[PDB]
Structures are given as structure tokens and as C-alpha cells.
Chain A
Amino acid sequence: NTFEDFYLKRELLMGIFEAGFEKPSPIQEEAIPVAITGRDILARAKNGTGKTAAFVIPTLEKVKPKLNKIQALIMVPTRELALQTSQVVRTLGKHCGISCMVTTGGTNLRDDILRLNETVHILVGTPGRVLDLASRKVADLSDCSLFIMDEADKMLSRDFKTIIEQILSFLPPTHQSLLFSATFPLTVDEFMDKHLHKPYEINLMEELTLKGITQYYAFVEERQKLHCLNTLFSKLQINQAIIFCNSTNRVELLAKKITDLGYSCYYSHARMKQQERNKVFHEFRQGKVRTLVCSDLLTRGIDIQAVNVVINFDFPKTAETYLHRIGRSGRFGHLGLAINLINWNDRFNLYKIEQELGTEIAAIPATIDKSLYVA
């Protein structure tokens, strides 16, 4: 209901109040209580200040200002994320009397080793730098009872995972772990069973991965859209493709326009019959027509191979929708291509979504490598 219902320090609640949060978003309602009891957490949820606070709030609750040692280590892959995180930390922990230091690859080692001479309670840093300072004995983690990984999936890749495990060596044998991620698959479970203890798993997203899928956006005016789509049909090697629109009307009109140009295609949407929907679905899976235009695919069937190109004719408003449209279910690196058509009023939704799902939607290049949407 409210943050006050979580029985937190006065100063922490003050911090939240000044920060302007009124009611806890669901990730906070789920994680904040479980975290403040000591239990480990493995959560999947979209990125945001909401989630960052969903773990920063417990951190500020646990750490004792009176003890001048590192009591919480917050690992992040990129420096900008260390910045944003530490910013949320300083904000919410405004009245808590708690020092938060950032230590990354972009910074100077000398200034960081110098900074660590003074009191630091919550350390926020990237794998390399943190392991460096840890090995150096510059950063004392003997009383660091709390370990956190935001965008954890980015740091459990082949190389980083080693560094993470080497950092974890310094932490006390008995320590709390909080692992957060946007994108579903986890590289290893040996890591999990070894380094986590009775973790309370949270999952607030569909089980879909953008792994292997190369994402591009293209700023295209509303009137210029069809021309652009044709240019893509002409310039891209497609065995089969799916187009997405934000309205049934636009779906039908676009499908009919595509058939009018000279490409055989089917269409589906919610306002269509269920039986007819699944019918067109299977018919498309067969490969009768080389394209489909659809508003919704509530029905989920794993990982259709044939499709190699996905296009958002209309950019979605929310990251859930975008994920449902682009995300494939196969845990393994499903190979695909996604092209988004960016309206003037979608420029923000692109920034937001790109951020929430923790993925990269780069500007569409003239020369798209054929290795990315066919093999």
C-alpha cells in the first residue's frame, strides 16, 4: 500500500518522501520486504529508478552508519549505471548519514585509492575496478554483508563471471545476495547454487529473450512509412517476416496495401475469430505467404525458425508489448532481425523501452550484415 507499511528507519522514509515516491511499484512491494529479512533474491524485472530503489531502499535500511566499513557492494556493468545507481543512493539516503562511492574504469585508480582512505559504506562499481581494488587490499570487504548485481546478466558472461567469483572471495562466507536482470536467460546455475542461498525468485516479465536478435530503429515520418517498408522489402533478404501495428484497422489496411504492392501476406488480430487466428497462424508457419501483419499474438508457440525479420510498423508504447513482439522464447541464441519505425511521438518510447529491457536499439545502417538475419 505505502512505503510506511514497510517498517523502515525514519530517515530512510524521509528520503523516500523527499524523493517523491508515494506508493511502491510492484517490484518494490515484492523485493523490499524479502530483502530486509536477509533472504537472497533473484528477480527479473524491467529496469528503472523504481527497481534501483527497490534494492537501494533495503541497502540503506541494512547498513549501519556508525560502522565505517563497506557494508554493501553494488555491481554494475556500465559506468553510467553506476552513476544513476549511486545517484538514487545519495538521493534516498539523504538523511541517513551514509557515504556512497563510485569506482569504475573511466576513473583514475589513484583518486579512488585516495578516496577509499575516507569512510565508504556503500560501494558502487564495475567488475574490473572493484576486483582490482579488492585484490589490492585497498577496499576492505571483510564486513560487507550485502552483495548486489544490477543488470547481472551482463556480468555473468564468460569473462566477467570469473571476475565476479573472484570478487565474491573477499566477501564474508555468510552474505546476502541480490541479483537483478531484464533479460531472462541465465548463463550458469553452478554459479547460482554455489553463490546464492535459498533465493526468493521474482519474475515480473514474460519469459522471452532478445538474445541473437539484432535491433535497429529508423526515424520515419507517418506519410513516409509505406515507402520505407517497401524499401526494406526490396533491400532485405527475407525468407519470412512478421509486421506489427498498433491497431486492427492499420493491420488490415497495411496487409492489403502490401498485397497491393506485390507481396503475398496474411493478417491476424484480436478482433478476429480465435479459430481463424490459429488457422492463419499455422498456415503462416507452413509458409504459404512470405509475410504476416498482426496486432496481437496472445497465443505463444516456441521459436518459429522460418521468420528471420520482424518489423514494428508502429512502435509500441510499453516495453512489455515490445518484448512480446520481438522476444523469442528459445533460451538459446535465436538469430533474428528487428526494425522499428520511429514516429515523432515515439522518440521517447524508444529511449524508455531501450532502457527498460536493457537492450540496444541502434540506428539502422545502410549496410546490414547478412550474418545477422540469415545463415
Chain B
Amino acid sequence: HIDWQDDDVSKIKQQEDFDFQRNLGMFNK
């Protein structure tokens, strides 16, 4: 079934805002 929910519990709700540019470099693997 689903995998994310455990991954991102709503309550903590804290991180340096997700950077797209860094993951766009991970586009090739």
C-alpha cells in the first residue's frame, strides 16, 4: 500500500523548504 504517510508525519511539519534544483540533478541515475 501507500508509503509516504509514515514518511512525512504532519505534526512535525518542519524542514528547510524542499529544494527542487538539487533533485533535478538526481534526474539521471
Interfacial residues, chain A to chain B (CB-CB below 8 A): 218-228, 230-231, 234-235, 247, 249-250, 253, 257, 260-262, 344, 347, 363-364, 366
- Cβ of B2 and Cβ of A253 under 8 Å apart? yes
- Cβ of A222 and Cβ of B3 under 8 Å apart? yes
Cβ 8 A contact of B20, one of A253, A262, A366: A366
Q: Which B residue's beta carbon lies closest to that of A224?
A: B18
- Size band of the B side of the interface? 20 to 34
Mark interface residues in B7-26 (1 if CB within 8 Å of A CB, else 0).
11011010101101101101
Give min CB distance, B26 to chain A, whole Å.
Answer: 6
Q: List 18 contacting pairs A-B, 8 Å CB cutoff, sorted by A.
A: A218-B20, A219-B24, A219-B26, A219-B27, A222-B7, A225-B7, A225-B8, A226-B4, A227-B15, A227-B18, A228-B18, A228-B20, A231-B17, A234-B17, A249-B2, A253-B2, A253-B5, A261-B13
Residues of chain A with a CB closer than 8 A to B10's CB = 257, 260-261
- Check A226/B7 contact, CB under 8 A, given A234-B17, A249-B2, A364-B20: yes
Give min CB distance, B5 to chain A, whole Å.
Answer: 5
A interface SS class: helix
Total of A-B residue pairs, C-beta within 8 Å: 61
- Cβ of A223 and Cβ of B2 under 8 Å apart? no
Residues of chain A with a CB closer than 8 A to B2's CB = 247, 249-250, 253
- Cβ of B17 and Cβ of A223 under 8 Å apart? no
Query: Given known contacts A231-B17, A250-B2, what 7 new A-B pairs fall within 8 Å (CB)?
Result: A220-B20, A222-B3, A227-B15, A228-B20, A249-B2, A253-B2, A347-B27
- Cβ of B23 and Cβ of A220 under 8 Å apart? yes
Q: Which A residue's beta carbon lies closest to that of B7?
A: A223
Q: Which B residue's beta carbon lies closest to that of A366?
A: B21
Give min CB distance, A231 to chain B, whole Å.
Answer: 4
- Cβ of A257 and Cβ of B5 under 8 Å apart? yes
- Check A249/B3 contact, CB under 8 A, given A223-B8, A227-B8: no
Q: Which B residue's beta carbon lies closest to that of A342?
A: B27
Residues of chain A with a CB closer than 8 A to B29's CB = 344
Q: Which 8 A-B pairs rank lowest in CB-CB distance, beginning with the nearest? A: A260-B10, A226-B8, A231-B18, A223-B7, A228-B18, A231-B17, A219-B23, A227-B18
Give min CB distance, B10 to chain A, whole Å.
Answer: 3
Question: In the complex the two chains form, what is the Cα distance from A363 to B10 in whole Å?
Answer: 27
- Cβ of B13 and Cβ of A230 under 8 Å apart? yes
Give min CB distance, A82 to chain B, whole Å.
Answer: 28
For A218, A227, A260, the residue with the greatest tally of chain B CB atoms inside 10 Å of its CB is: A227
- Check A218/B23 contact, CB under 8 A, given A225-B4, A344-B29: yes
Residues of chain A with a CB closer than 8 A to B23's CB = 218-221, 224
Cβ 8 A contact of B3, one of A223, A235, A363, A366: A223
Q: Which B residue's beta carbon lies closest to that of A249?
A: B2
- Cβ of A222 and Cβ of B18 under 8 Å apart? no
Give min CB distance, A219 to chain B, whole Å.
Answer: 5
Question: In the complex the two chains form, what is the Cα distance from A231 to B5 in whole Å?
Answer: 16
Q: Which A residue's beta carbon lies closest to that of B26?
A: A219
Question: In the complex the two chains form, what is the Cα distance from A227 to B21 in whole Å?
Answer: 15
Q: Which A residue's beta carbon lies closest to that of B6?
A: A223
Give min CB distance, A56 to chain B, whole Å.
Answer: 33
Q: Which B residue's beta carbon lies closest to that of A247?
A: B2
